[PDB]
Amino acid sequence: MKGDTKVINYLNKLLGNELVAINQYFLHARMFKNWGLKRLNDVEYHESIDEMKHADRYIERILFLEGLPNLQDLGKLNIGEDVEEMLRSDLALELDGAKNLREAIGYADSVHDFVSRDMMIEILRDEEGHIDWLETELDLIQKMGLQNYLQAQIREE
Amino acid sequence: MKGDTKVINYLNKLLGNELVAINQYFLHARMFKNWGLKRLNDVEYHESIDEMKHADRYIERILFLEGLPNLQDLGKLNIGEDVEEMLRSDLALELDGAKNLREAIGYADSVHDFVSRDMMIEILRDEEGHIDWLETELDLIQKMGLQNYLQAQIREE
Amino acid sequence: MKGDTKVINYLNKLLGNELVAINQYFLHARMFKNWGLKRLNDVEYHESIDEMKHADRYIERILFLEGLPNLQDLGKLNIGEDVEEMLRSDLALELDGAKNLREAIGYADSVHDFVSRDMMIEILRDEEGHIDWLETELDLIQKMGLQNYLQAQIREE
Amino acid sequence: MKGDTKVINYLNKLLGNELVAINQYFLHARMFKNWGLKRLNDVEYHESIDEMKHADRYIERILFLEGLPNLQDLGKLNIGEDVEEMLRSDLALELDGAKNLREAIGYADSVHDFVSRDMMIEILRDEEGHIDWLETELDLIQKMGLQNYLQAQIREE
Amino acid sequence: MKGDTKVINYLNKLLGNELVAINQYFLHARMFKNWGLKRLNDVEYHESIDEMKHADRYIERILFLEGLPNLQDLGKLNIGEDVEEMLRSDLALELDGAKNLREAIGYADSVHDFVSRDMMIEILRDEEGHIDWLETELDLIQKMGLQNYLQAQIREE
Amino acid sequence: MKGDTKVINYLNKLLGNELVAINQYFLHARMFKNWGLKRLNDVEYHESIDEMKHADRYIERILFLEGLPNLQDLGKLNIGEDVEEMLRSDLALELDGAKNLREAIGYADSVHDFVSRDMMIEILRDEEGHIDWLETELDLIQKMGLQNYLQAQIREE
Amino acid sequence: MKGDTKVINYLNKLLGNELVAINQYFLHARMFKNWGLKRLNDVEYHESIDEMKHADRYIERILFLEGLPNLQDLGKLNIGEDVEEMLRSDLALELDGAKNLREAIGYADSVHDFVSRDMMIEILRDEEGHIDWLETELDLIQKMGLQNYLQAQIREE
């Protein structure tokens, strides 16, 4: 079913955000795993999987709308080198992605693509959950100090 | 069964104490939850539920005694802005309510309302348990230091 | 994640509506229970629980958006003295709350807070369910007469 | 297998009767449901389903006999505005349908389409069951009075 | 609860679209069944059921809003005489109905009937799924040729 | 119980038809089995079994009515040499048998042997099902072509 | 444990190959899904998952060897526009990756990194399995023709 060209463009932009996050979350997860921070490996791995599900949804929606999903272009990752930098980079990426989502959701409504909008709102709700988790972890690092924080990650939850 | 007017007045005062505590414990729980202090969310949530049960018992008793339960007036909440402050506020509220319970229990005895007294004694035993828990947590904050204390709250027990 | 100030104000207003309804439904339920109208006790109790869930969602959303939930102010309850008067008062409260919800949902869309909007639409759906139930009960009182209506409430369903 | 032209015509006429009854029973059920008359929603819904099964049998028989099922033409519904009026309308429709069935059953026999006749006799037996139920309910409204009758419908049976 | 008159008119228009589709899908299903195309009978039958569910939701919503559901008027069926023709007709009907849904969804938003809107968005998501299925089947007829396509339908999947 | 002589004569004629069909269906089944067309073996074998059941019913009915079942005379088989020929021959036999059944059913009614008639109507319903199956397969051969049709028979259904 | 710099460089090159294949296989899978070719969706999806597992192994190995996994650079995808083109492109990518694996396996042996080598040989065995599958499907398209081939993909295996 032929979709709106700019809706497809938004879907590809958001798909692009998801592809960066999939890789960044996954690399962070395995960095945490290497360092023995099992709990952070588990959560970040889960976040990567969640972004994969989102990417899949964008891909299928774009195809249904008769557009071409773009998995070729990959945006900039910012890996970081310590736990705080890594989590802050994931947070910055989530915030940029949420801004893109809000713009796309408003636009989809205006051209009456209510199903694409509904999909995007569910994904945005997911992203805000990730934002909440990242903000909370960053605050905990400050509240309990980095040494206690790292200790609290070595066992799975 | 027409009850003693002053007993009903005490039950409404105690109901009022419970209504403040229900809201204060519940808000504290969700603040703790927001901050990632899962253990404190769990305990404060269950304390809110306990106070709800007490409130229900007062409402039912007042209605049996043919009085009018007052759920309209709400006493002063003191939320606090950090963990120690919030727990100290909960403890102060518990102590104030225990003072009112002791008065009411003595009075109900003087007018031979032994069933209302029996109900309030069970509720007071409940509140002294909350007092014990709050006192103990506050002591632990001082003994292990705030950073260790916060770390100990992030996993459910 | 810092939310829009007016959205947070709306959420607090709606939270306020839920807080009135929680108490009014709960007192109505126990009044019905006292009178032996078991069926009405069961329904109104479950409606009170439903509004508690809504209140919880508002409290959590407000805290996420870095606002301060207001559980201190409690709006006007209208208890009523007979079954029809009590149900009419619950209906009036539901209808006032639905108006507030519609205004907030429109505004959340305007400022692109689609996740707060999604939450409120779910809550509004729940509220219209309560309205449906209340309207239906009030019509039944008129159609079968009060004596038959009361007889119909003494067994749990 | 090429069927008799007038047998196919009768089947389409009967199918036409069932199509009206499907919609009228269904709308009646949901009207009853809206009014809180659960027992009447349940019965009328099941009657709508029964007529759907009959419609299915006619459609399949017409196609087997190489005719064209007519689902385009819809005869007159008579909804009515109160319980007695609605049930009387359903009864009138059943009685007209039964007349048509009797005529078709005699004709099918005359042209030796004994399998179409056998199908129609089973359907007619079903319809007379509905007529029995409707007559019984209408008599009950008169014997116990409308207020008692409505009270008897609020719980599923 | 007295609804918006124009929302009710849209709900009746959409209900009308559903009623045509219910009949058209069901007849197509049984035509496929008669031809031995079991897979196509199964899918089209379930699409008919899906449209019945949508019709039910519209009927219940309209009654809640104190309108009168129109099951009397039935729009034009376009049955068709061969598999491709039939599937194309179902697709054309889906596309017309989606256009009506988009219009109604936009309007309900303007009058703040967000629950009616939410219901219609879910139904639109369902219809776009049917559109996807129909488009895909039509393309398959072209890609594998009609003889292979028909062979692929004779066993249930 | 002494039956009507001409009813018994009809029952023997019908039994005769069944006896030819039992053999023709069984041989067809095993020819298809030899050819590797497992699906056709399965169905035709089942049809032979069905005709055995019918023959058993006629034999038992004739004996109850104090007549002599005739299993000695066997009418003409037309085996055919390819799938289409074989299926057409089964269809022609079914059609001839159905005309005989119709005559016998009308006659039984005229002499008030309603039990023999009832038995024959059930059997006729069964034969029309075989007719529907054969007509459908023959059409499928034409629509998908013989090569696809044969391919579709090699696996069991 | 500090690894050999050129081994890490090989591991990143191989990881790079896997990253292209993950995306190319996944997009191919969802294109096939959109087209109704369920069998090809299932297999290609599985191949994408397999390449994710390989990528995970490289990432973990690189980190153990104290290098930096490169998930930022993504090589050229060649999506293609029809089934044969898409499959040939997957085959070409697999063949390019296998040549890289062979080079890396020989090199790892020369610097005595036998564990990295062992990991890569297992992965190469997996890729040759994908190569066998793709070569086989491409031959089948030719042997049975595209129309039969597409028909064979519409059901899950």
From Swiss-Prot, chains A, B, C, D, E, F, G:
Binding positions (heme b): 52
GO terms, biological process: intracellular iron ion homeostasis; iron ion transport
Catalytic reaction list: 4 Fe(2+) + O2 + 4 H(+) = 4 Fe(3+) + 2 H2O; Fe(2+)(in) = Fe(2+)(out)
Domain spans labelled Ferritin-like diiron: 1-145
Keyword Oxidoreductase: yes
Enzyme class: oxidoreductase
Miscellaneous information on this protein: The internal surface iron site that binds iron 3 is important for the mineralization phase but not for Fe(2+) binding and oxidation at the ferroxidase center.
Name assigned to this protein: Bacterioferritin
